[PDB]
Curated annotation (Swiss-Prot), chain E:
<dbReference type="GO" id="GO:0022829">
    <property type="term" value="F:wide pore channel activity"/>
</dbReference>
<dbReference type="GO" id="GO:0005262">
    <property type="term" value="F:calcium channel activity"/>
</dbReference>
<keyword id="KW-0106">Calcium</keyword>
<keyword id="KW-0702">S-nitrosylation</keyword>
<dbReference type="GO" id="GO:0006812">
    <property type="term" value="P:monoatomic cation transport"/>
</dbReference>
<dbReference type="GO" id="GO:0005886">
    <property type="term" value="C:plasma membrane"/>
</dbReference>
<dbReference type="GO" id="GO:0032059">
    <property type="term" value="C:bleb"/>
</dbReference>
<comment type="subunit">
    <text>Homoheptameric.</text>
</comment>
<keyword id="KW-1133">Transmembrane helix</keyword>
<keyword id="KW-0597">Phosphoprotein</keyword>
<dbReference type="GO" id="GO:0002020">
    <property type="term" value="F:protease binding"/>
</dbReference>
<feature type="transmembrane region" description="Helical">
    <location>
        <begin position="78"/>
        <end position="98"/>
    </location>
</feature>
<comment type="similarity">
    <text>Belongs to the pannexin family.</text>
</comment>
<dbReference type="GO" id="GO:0005921">
    <property type="term" value="C:gap junction"/>
</dbReference>
<keyword id="KW-0221">Differentiation</keyword>
<dbReference type="GO" id="GO:0006816">
    <property type="term" value="P:calcium ion transport"/>
</dbReference>
<feature type="modified residue" description="Phosphotyrosine">
    <location>
        <position position="142"/>
    </location>
</feature>
Length: 315, 315, 309, 312, 313, 309
């Protein structure tokens, strides 16, 4: 009852923990030198006057009139808001898995548990009929899967959460590629504390050379995040192609039972049946009847004996 | 017994954790530079005199006589009390859930557990009667359903907590939209430490140019909170109109039981019955009898066999 | 603990604590709580001495001269501990209640619920055999002594008294003037008295006062909103409604008598606690199902009881 | 632990702890606990040395000269530790009695409740057989409890130590609370060792112990709460006075139970057991039903054995 | 679900870089900032702080700093802490298979094999008990089938091979750090871009030194030593066939209800992996325990096979 | 994990960790780990540069000149981590023991206990009917291969080897002169080489090295007290005694044979683990009650066993 495919669990783990791990690294007790901005006030300035210049320019990356930067004010905005953008991406990437687990999870589980119980029951009834021969009959699970072939609401939830995950991953790739595509000189901006009563003041110099520290770390981490995300996006796209992944028809092994109709009827659709096929292919190893039937099916590759006889021997 | 609808749990989680997360972000070490205010005392001022000017003006954003600001004293008040406002909204948004958690639960959880037990019992009795055929009778829960429609005690509590949540969310949206609408130059105010014995003092200048730092971060976070809240408000509203959300009649699947009267009788009212319908639609997946009955109902879409026979096979 | 009482306790206790932590948190604070503006000639440590001396000197009335008086000065230092004192005093009655009051009402309520389940079982067994008042006297006794409830209304009355005293204190401090933090201070006792390098007086200002007043008005608003709730909760008889035992009157093994209303006696308190905890009683749930069905009046009470099983 | 004893412990222990935690509020403390006002010529580190030296020198009586004396200085510097000491000493008797005395009374009380339920069952069974051994074992057990008071002597001893420690704390807080309010200011001289004949260092420094006023304002609060708590302990100290509403009197209407209360008037373990029975007796179902019959008997309409048989 | 040698290889290869990161930045070994630049005496405190932070950020901008070794050694130190964590994460990723729900791929089949072995043991002793008073080798056929596809094991050798590749890449990277002279921290720095370019009060260049780099190299050599000790373990663990000896089944051949055939050896196929996992988890099987008791007794030959089987009951 | 092994692990691992945490106590540590005494003319930041340069320069042998040598300087700075390395290496064998060998012995021991309870039940059932050796062969087999125990003595031997290496290192480190923490450092590489305002050499001293030596001698004392314990634990045969299965020999359904002694084989290890975990076995407890009684002769063994029920 995991209700989360291993590839989906790992995609979520990566896409969420990587921006968080990178945020935590960008401010390691060993990577931050100190403040995020330094402005180089004149030597005549006192300690507190220099602190004022630093804090003023930090707050002044927003006020476009005060600061003059060669690259523009937009790089300054992006440099100051550096860590917020990654936590936002982590949260947005965590949202679709949360929507999946909160509502979609429970619905998928009940049906799969019922299908496994019905398969075990049909196996028991088939071997009991075979045992009585050695001494109703309605394909209920087949009809249930035929019904699942119709409504795709159960799957559309899955491909929708995967599609939002892919969209957010692509938007994060775009943002990180832009941010890394930084000038790497745009962190140096000229700042002027000359609004208000300081405007015509003379002891204060006209402009200060400020630099936004710990930016290079942001870009080096953004390229790492972008690489991992462009490696992750094909995985999500493949996860999206849910019918293509439905392979090795799991119910085909049950077709050798008399109490089971000879019909797979599970393929070719953007419908909940393909999703159920994937989840059955995953959780079917827990089904003992499936295990024994697959043993007989593999033996049938040689073709030495016969299916009903072998089943009777297994008991 | 979660006793909280998934949409309500997520609305609470968002509306409460988002202001808390934003408070915690607004003072992340990388994000802040130092003090919340800086005042630029003259160069002749000692370190402690400049500290006095900073702290005095910080405390003087309240005393309207001391500070002269172009935007007014109200922006100064709003800038100083940025953090306090965020927590208060989180608490008020968490207050409704707390009342629901303790006051609301006895009325509903007990009733829902009783309804689920009665449904399992009627299912068992119906299959036992069917099994005896293959070899009292009072609709107590249905009588119970009528009470829900006539009783709004367990509902009016729900729509009241939801309505207070919506009202507080709208008040938070109004406050955040106002705060974000602040001048962004209103963080610079002129401050004069000239009350008391300093009034006619000469070494102290007439006025100081103070600037409130960490206000741009407050506005950037307030717009995020406002966006998330105006996205959340339709969800709460959507939520307020329960009569509309009561859909996919859950008891309709039980109408195929002989031991159960053929009557849904659950719709169209601002009464506790609609609330109970929502909570049943949520918690009904835990009911095994409901799961099996829904399996039979979905199979009935094809119409191959028959309802009582299918039930007998399931046993 | 009744839901309204639990929420009143939660508010009246956590609000002063949350408000202390608001102002209390280091990030919210600019720095020290007092700043005194020593002269420029003073060294760093001399200015620190002036600050700390005046901070400790808001008590010594001889040193400081303030226009409003020494009481406003003492009030500021008092407030961080005064809010915690109010939180503790407001937590005390709920603590006394759970420690003493619940044990007496808990045993009685558990016994009443067990007796109700037993009478229901016996009634359906008699009805089943046909198809084939100890609890009332106990409640009549509860109708007499109000000592069991007197504990409840006493803890509620102390809660109301402490809430009103907190409202008075918070309203008093909030009006103030705010010029008190601007009161002067003179470090001229002892050997510094006739010293000349030290100025006669310093202009000190109490840091983070405005935050205290803005939070005190919030606490006062919430408390004057909470006081009517306690007063309503104070009146136990009014809240006793939707007679819970009336649903049991349809049992043959149960006498036809509610006999639970109209008094400042422990019976009304027990009625409230029964109305709260009665949903746990399965027999009450089934009986209420039958009673709601009886609104339509289609069948009959004993038949549905027997049929319901 | 009786509710009044639990609340007395909670107050007497948590109040000094809460007051310690308040005395060091991140908003009531201006900074260091002492400030000494070195001369202007002194560097930052020299002034720090003067502060720390005088802080450590409130003990060395030769260095500091104070008008009130060295004892106020000691009390001003060791104010916290003393409150924690009082909290610990006040927590000790509840720890002691709970560890050993509790189980002794718990086993006996559980046995008494079981025996009462058994005698009730036997009485109604005899009455039921009439509608269709005999040894007062619990009465004899309580008669025995009436003898040795050692089981209760533990209780009144822990209560008496609690009262003694509360009174000692009241005395200390009243003494400490009633301060000169000038003591916080002491003259300190860093002139021992090689600094003795040094000339650049002044003869004496004016030090002040900051946040002492907070200590006194909190000590008066602690003293008020403690002198309000002491009458509660004294009342709780007197076990015999507390007992009332004879709980076993309701059982006297049973045939299988002898007609004898025999529980009153002594500084013996029987009175303590009476209190604990009065507390824990509501859990006893037989007691509940018997009290129902006893309250009905106030009207006197029917009869005790008939209503008991009808009780079932 | 994770072999003890694999669990310990993961624990080492992951926790060692993390422990070394945590050690490198311990208060007792860190003196303070990671860089110090020695501004002139005329510079104020904040001007010196600006020089330090500027040069720290300027190890990237190649135009500002002039170092004898080059800019690559400078960039290596700053990213060294990040690499330690990157290597830990990449080494944790393959074990991620164990973390993920891949247990059913191997354990569920194992659970079936153990149940079938207990069942065949019970049936054999019941037949022997009836003598004292179907018959299809299903598990043998299942293992014969496992002897076919090696896809189930290919997952295992693939995660082990990625672990080995990442360990070797980490060894290569760490080897490099130890090899470097690291005078790199002594590289000069010039705060003369922008308006400071033609400024005169600021000196032409500053002598900066990178703090905690000697600690980084001393820890990198430790990590490299542990990793080159760990790589042979992974290589041995890589060879699943060379890792299998004394198969558990050879003890079940003394049962009448069990065919006389081990048929489990010699292949890069899932059968060898299942043999390893059976050798590990077989001690939980009670029937295996009793059969091994009889097999060990058979070394002496004092007691008959079927007789001792029936005798044990 | 045997109690002596658990305590040896706890000591050998937590002691270096506790000592690391003590060496850097806030009261204990004064500040930085190095101080260099720049001239008075040097600014604050120039002195900080000298400190940090010399800290990083304990490695570069050309810069610093120390009387003891550069190796003591390396050991000074690397001493804190070295203790964590010893803690980790000492934790490794117990960790290996938990996964590699503990389950192998756990399954076997649980099976032996179950078989002993079963044989006891069968013996008393046979005795009860009168009133109205699989485990031995398994242990005989264990007497063969010592591979199961070889894991145990191997983890113990690695623990002893690492403890002895730690003793050697700590005895060497404590044998430092305690003046080797004072080294002369010269910031004169690069453009500072021919600079004149900077003095030729600085007198630096390594902070918290006396604390390191005082803690290293404590660690060495505890480790040389622990090493004999490991050596004794190393000899499994010398430890086994009080033959635990001898109490079972009084059962008819159990063969009269202890057959557990005298070998560097897994049987002795299993004997130790049985002696430890056998108190959980109820049948063993009753047999020891009566097994001891049989020696006394007060009552006969089968009669008391039947009476045991």
């Amino acid at each position: 009852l995991r209700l989360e495919l291993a590839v989906d669990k790992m995609v979520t783990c990566i896409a969420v923990g990587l921006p968080l791990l990178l945020i935590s690294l960008a401010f390691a007790q060993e990577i931050s030198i100190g403040t995020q901005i330094s402005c180089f006030s004149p030597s005549s300035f006192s300690w507190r006057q220099a602190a004022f210049v630093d804090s003023y320019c930090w707050a002044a990356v927003q006020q476009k009139n005060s600061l003059q930067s060669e690259s523009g004010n937009l790089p300054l905005w992006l440099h100051k808001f550096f860590p917020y953008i990654l936590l936002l991406f982590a949260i947005l990437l965590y949202l679709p898995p949360l929507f999946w687990r909160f509502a979609a999870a429970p619905h998928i589980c009940s049906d799969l548990k019922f299908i496994m119980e019905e398969l075990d029951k049909v196996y028991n009834r088939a071997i009991k009929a075979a045992k009585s021969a050695r001494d109703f009959k309605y394909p209920i699970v087949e009809q249930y899967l035929k019904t699942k072939k119709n409504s795709n609401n159960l799957i559309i939830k899955y491909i929708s959460c995967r599609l939002l995950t892919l969209i957010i991953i692509l938007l994060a790739c775009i943002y990180l590629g832009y941010y890394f595509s930084l000038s790497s000189l745009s962190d140096e901006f000229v700042c002027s504390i000359k609004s208000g009563i300081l405007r015509n003041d003379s002891t204060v110099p006209d402009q200060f050379q400020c630099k936004l520290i710990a930016v290079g770390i942001f870009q080096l981490l953004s390229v790492i995040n972008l690489v991992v995300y462009v490696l992750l996006a094909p995985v999500v796209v493949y996860t999206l192609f849910v019918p293509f992944r439905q392979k090795t028809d799991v119910l085909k092994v049950y077709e050798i039972l008399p109490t089971f109709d000879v019909l797979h009827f599970k393929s070719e659709g953007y419908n909940d049946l393909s999703l159920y096929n994937l989840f059955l292919e995953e959780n079917i190893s827990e089904v003992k009847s499936y295990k024994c039937l697959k043993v007989l099916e593999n033996i049938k590759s040689s073709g030495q004996g016969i299916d009903p006889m072998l089943l009777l021997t297994n008991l």
